Design a protein around this ligand. Structure first.
Ligand SMILES: *[C@@H]1O[C@H](CO)[C@@H](O)[C@H](O)[C@H]1NC(C)=O
Ligand SMILES: *[C@@H]1O[C@H](CO)[C@@H](O)[C@H](O)[C@H]1NC(C)=O
Ligand SMILES: *[C@@H]1O[C@H](CO)[C@@H](O)[C@H](O)[C@H]1NC(C)=O
Ligand SMILES: *[C@@H]1O[C@H](CO)[C@@H](O)[C@H](O)[C@H]1NC(C)=O
Ligand SMILES: *[C@@H]1O[C@H](CO)[C@@H](O)[C@H](O)[C@H]1NC(C)=O
Ligand SMILES: *[C@@H]1O[C@H](CO)[C@@H](O)[C@H](O)[C@H]1NC(C)=O
Ligand SMILES: *[C@@H]1O[C@H](CO)[C@@H](O)[C@H](O)[C@H]1NC(C)=O
Ligand SMILES: *[C@@H]1O[C@H](CO)[C@@H](O)[C@H](O)[C@H]1NC(C)=O
Ligand SMILES: [Ca+2]
Ligand SMILES: [Ca+2]
Ligand SMILES: [Ca+2]
Ligand SMILES: [Ca+2]
Lengths: 389, 389, 389, 389
């Protein structure tokens, strides 16, 4: 192949069309489907795949008991053909661990998995199916990364990683990879106070990462990365439309340079947005408290305008159904003259919200932009929890 | 590859030989087989595949309960290697939705899935494995399409779609795609009064679609499409041999220009015919009332002669067994100097005819033409419903 | 590719080494393994595959009940990667039917399946994955063919087919195929009185088929086919070592030109031999009455010497275990200067010999020649029938 | 491809990073996973695969009963994509038997399986997927080989095999293969007193095999092989750090030229080391008595210095968990200027240590060297044996 260069702008988006849905929990009620969480999608020149962190057991298996827990030696990053549900028979092991990112540079895939004990974790960086670089924890407190795809440009693939408290100031770094080797590392700079779980996309030779502040803000940090110069800046999303969970009600003015506090009971969830002037879209859970529902809001100049509000709206998952993490991806190899925004929603089933079962797992739904004004309906998980009792 | 051009005539057919049978319900009694309905086949230069609309569950799974229902967020168009039964392990997700068509232009496959709410559904058109076009509902009442393969000629792949009432006049359009993009759209014209579920095939640079009139006629509408001029005409199958279900008795004279009414209790079923002067074959269910049995009748000049009758007869599924939808396909890439007709029959098991189970699904049988005079037997589903009680 | 020509002689064989074993019944006690019978193997330039006639159900499925029966619309020829057990997930459907043969001509595979009712069955001949020729029953009584591989030479692949009584004179024909088209058909001629289930191999531009006389002989018929001249002759295997089942004791003299009668209670079983002068090997069941045990006997000049006996002996399946059909195959594309003989044994389990279960199925073992004098042990099926009760 | 030449030295190793983990026993509690033991890994130019000896049954199947037994006609060497668990659906049968080795020469894979009765076993040597050579037992007492990968150089792939007593002097040979054909055979020479189960790796045009003395020594034999001259020498690992199991306490001085006796109750376990001057690493079970736990010890000049001790430690499996066999492999086709050491640990579950179940099987974990000083945690099997009772 040839290296991906982010030469195209973003496509105009007026609504979202269905891309894929795996129905993994419905199917997994009776087929051999593995337990997962923290899914995402990532494309390459030959097609798009689903990704997630396995828990090393099937959904109906006795080892599904206790899968609310996030980190163990039995987790792995696995990928599979888009739309299928993940089984022990159709999944490729990308790397071993409990926090991950992956992206394709046009020639080969880079996958990163972090594993080990909380006080001394390590990333193993794979390129082209081999391991090539290892990175020790720098702060001794749950070294962790994006939980969705990275983005490459001219062979440089920046990745955002954090080590340190989840509830206080941490140590975040931007690592610039080439063939899975470190070309440059930067300490986080700018106004973002805390960085977790960045959802990133590229357009017009720049990468934007929309992340989770788990310490203070209900507004999301935004890291802007120049992959050719290998530099970054950070701020908060300016818009008054708040998109973390938990969050307070939308205030009259957002904040660019500082967190907006508030919300109960949880400090954060992975999410995303596409920031392109008038062509800007913010995703968020419908509930301001819980990971329930999911909606897309078109918010012109969300990135720069503190009073920017929504001019259009699409419900992706109604508020009577559980959502979860969400993130950005793009098919950078599509036959279009612009890069078309896509996103996924993790549809979490089981604990803590559904305590009648002993497990936690998820299914996936993914959508991409349309220039049309399409009708829509809810793409919820669809499984009956009673069937699992 | 190279673009398919429909340069060949149809082959002479004197009987039908067995092509494939998946035995899906027998196998699915104990293996992990997904619930489907609305199956078909479609070929490409490398081989032929089975296609159908999944229900997002396995046959033995608890979520099989309730699958009589036609439209949900859990359905998708899936394809698999011809002859296998469809499982979560061997199926490719073509697109997401509850009404579909698919065809190959010699270079790439186009697959179309319609999804969303009845009052605001949308088609997503995929080409080469990517989404390329979206079409919103134009009449706000269950946007829907062929449920068997489309046909391509010189890169133009016409598709018949309907939006509007199932029991009254609707809005049908002929959409001419190239690389999944719309080149032309036409409103239905001609004598056909209602168009559903067209079964199409190509020969000598023309495409014929034999459809289902769900409003009035027990004779089938025929849409004739010229793919290079991107124009069409429509009328009814002239023959007194009536081939919808339900239908009345075959009258003394058919009708070319109007529906022949009658039949109880059902308004229609998807079906097909091959219309080629003396070399013409009509399929229909054996029962005039119910989707039971299936027979092929050789009816010379069926397309044009209101007094045409059967000169030969093959029972495909005996009338002590359930059939279902039926449709046309051809392997346009065969090593023959003519295009040989093929068809499938959907073998529906479970509800509503078999109410001892909670689910509805099917298996598939497919046959192609022979110039020989072959013996034959019934190719029914073969599952024992008592085993599922 | 390039056409296979039978330019090499047979390899010297002094003992037999293990090639493959699928353990299908053992595995199928808990995994999704399909019920089969009449297995065989066949190679192509890329590798060797296993083949068999499916019954359209898994072994543990309720539809395994009644699989003692030989002919149904639910049977298919399937192939899979050598050594795996056949499941709904790893098997390729070659053609649909209840009697089959298949061979690769160096460029593409020809597969033939016969289906239909006993009085009007038909063969469908596939080449390169596509059906190309159909053959109607010529005698109205179970048209049937080899149940192991055919052999090709310079693009010509002869096949032996029989139509007519199983217990009286029948009508056998040798059909010479090219790209699955009939180039020539001959009626059986020579001294063989009844021909079933031929096991064929090629060497030095000639093909030999060792068959089953189900009418009279306990000695096996041998059809010698010249593929370039498209002619054949037939006789009986001359040796006194009788190799049908059931059979009487080996007499002081065999017969070349007529059947040796005797044996109780069964009229025949599919089997094979390699006939190469001093380098000749005969397979047979160990039991003279039942399909129990399996042994190889080196019988120099078996083909021509009525007094030939065994000079060496290898037990393949001990006589405390069930065997079944057996047949010849060769990897004609190996990197050797001679063609090495291989064979398989079908290890039949269930009915009629094991009536505590409701099903009949088999596993497979395959071996090839060695010039070494290797040690050996029994390669019996290995499943515990008590586990299935 | 091109022949692999061992032109590179070993990479510097200061700690070990996780490469793969299949979690086979956790998954196999409910999915169709085959029972195995004696696993390893081996790479080729396209990637790395897991290998092991199947027992011809699934873990949950009733035929899992009795799998503590090591040799049967139902075992085979199978391979699968690294990281997946082994099922009947994702495994390639390499050859049939109960002792194996496999390695890739840059062009094709050589796989060797031994089968047959204890007094008359035979090796079948496969190359490029075909059988090419057979080797009869030379001493009539359990002909057996490495149970981990061989190593190739310039098309020569030496393999160590033993025939004879497990508890007294045996007859070991070094067999030099090229395209699976024997180029040279040597009787074992040098100071090693008993050789089993060698773990081999290549560097700087030489091969080192670290084996198991089952007769006398708790120190491990080391065979040094020159693949281009096709010669070898043998001695013992000099270091006082003893790495067989069972073993006594580490003494003040090791022994180069003789076994160190002692230890209770078991005579040996397969193991490995990387011997590269200062860059030397030894693995062993943590327990001196039992196959429990696993640790890596960096022991400079372990190969030459009888007083060499550990300068660094990493626990791979804690001593509250079962281990098993362990062995060396390297991705010789990696994009590095050195060959990086890797190893696996077999994690044995069930009998004899866990007698609440009727079966014996394992999962696998594999790690490779890092120049970093990484943190670490235990990579134990992770299955709950209570779930299987
Ligand atoms: C992207 O740019 C790089 C130089 O930075 C170039 O080598 C590569 O060919 C480009 N990729 C394509 C697809 O043009
Ligand atoms: C689930 O795991 C918990 C904690 O390890 C244990 O106490 C409980 O018995 C398990 N429950 C089941 C149903 O296996
Ligand atoms: C079919 O016609 C198209 C366009 O007219 C041409 O480009 C193509 O090569 C033709 N196909 C073949 C197989 O010749
Ligand atoms: C089937 O679905 C109906 C409707 O939701 C439900 O009430 C019923 O209990 C279900 N039956 C079973 C056996 O799950
Ligand atoms: C075999 O002979 C055929 C026809 O006699 C010839 O065309 C072909 O080239 C030969 N095949 C090989 C592999 O030499
Ligand atoms: C097996 O099939 C026979 C014959 O159809 C039937 O009478 C019997 O009920 C079946 N047994 C089981 C256990 O399904
Ligand atoms: C390894 O050496 C062999 C023979 O000495 C040579 O033919 C081969 O090309 C070499 N391999 C590479 C990758 O250069
Ligand atoms: C396990 O196998 C043993 C040995 O043959 C047998 O005695 C026992 O009955 C078997 N147990 C089960 C539960 O099948
Ligand atoms: Ca927050
Ligand atoms: Ca009608
Ligand atoms: Ca006989
Ligand atoms: Ca020892």
């Amino acid at each position: 192949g040839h290296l991906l260069n982010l030469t195209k702008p973003l496509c105009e988006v007026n609504s979202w069309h269905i891309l894929s849905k795996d129905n993994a929990i419905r199917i997994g009620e009776d087929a051999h489907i593995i337990v997962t969480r923290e899914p995402y999608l990532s494309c390459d020149p030959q097609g798009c795949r689903m990704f997630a962190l396995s828990q090393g057991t099937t959904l109906r298996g006795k080892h599904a008991n206790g899968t609310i827990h996030d980190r163990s030696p039995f987790r792995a990053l696995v990928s599979w053909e888009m739309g299928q549900a993940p089984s022990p028979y159709n999944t490729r092991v990308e790397c071993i661990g409990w926090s991950s990112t992956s992206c394709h540079d046009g020639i080969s895939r880079m996958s990163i998995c972090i594993s080990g004990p909380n006080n001394n974790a390590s990333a193993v960086v794979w390129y082209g199916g081999r391991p090539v670089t290892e990175i020790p924890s720098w702060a001794g407190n749950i070294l962790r990364t994006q939980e969705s795809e990275c983005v490459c440009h001219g062979g440089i693939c920046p990745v955002v990683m954090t080590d340190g408290p989840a509830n206080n100031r941490a140590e975040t770094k931007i690592i610039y990879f080439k063939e899975g080797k470190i070309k440059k590392i930067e300490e986080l700079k700018g106004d973002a106070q805390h960085i977790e779980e960045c959802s990133c996309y590229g357009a017009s030779e720049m990468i934007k990462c929309i992340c989770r502040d788990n310490w203070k803000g209900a507004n999301r940090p935004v890291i802007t990365i120049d992959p050719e110069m290998m530099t970054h800046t950070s701020k908060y999303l300016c818009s008054k439309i708040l998109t973390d969970t938990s969050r307070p009600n939308d205030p009259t003015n957002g904040k660019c340079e500082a967190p907006i506090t508030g919300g109960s009971p949880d400090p954060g969830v992975k999410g995303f947005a596409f920031l392109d002037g008038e062509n800007s879209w913010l995703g968020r859970t419908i509930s301001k408290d819980s990971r329930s529902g999911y909606e897309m809001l078109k918010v012109p100049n969300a990135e720069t305008d503190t009073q920017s509000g929504a001019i259009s709206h699409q419900i992706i998952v109604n508020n009577q159904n559980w959502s979860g993490y969400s993130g950005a991806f793009i098919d950078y190899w599509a036959n279009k003259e612009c890069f078309n925004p896509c996103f996924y929603v993790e549809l979490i089933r089981g604990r803590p919200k559904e305590s009648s079962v002993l497990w936690t797992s998820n299914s996936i739904v993914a959508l991409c932009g349309s220039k049309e004004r399409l009708g829509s309906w809810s793409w919820h998980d669809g499984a009956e929890i009673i069937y699992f009792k």
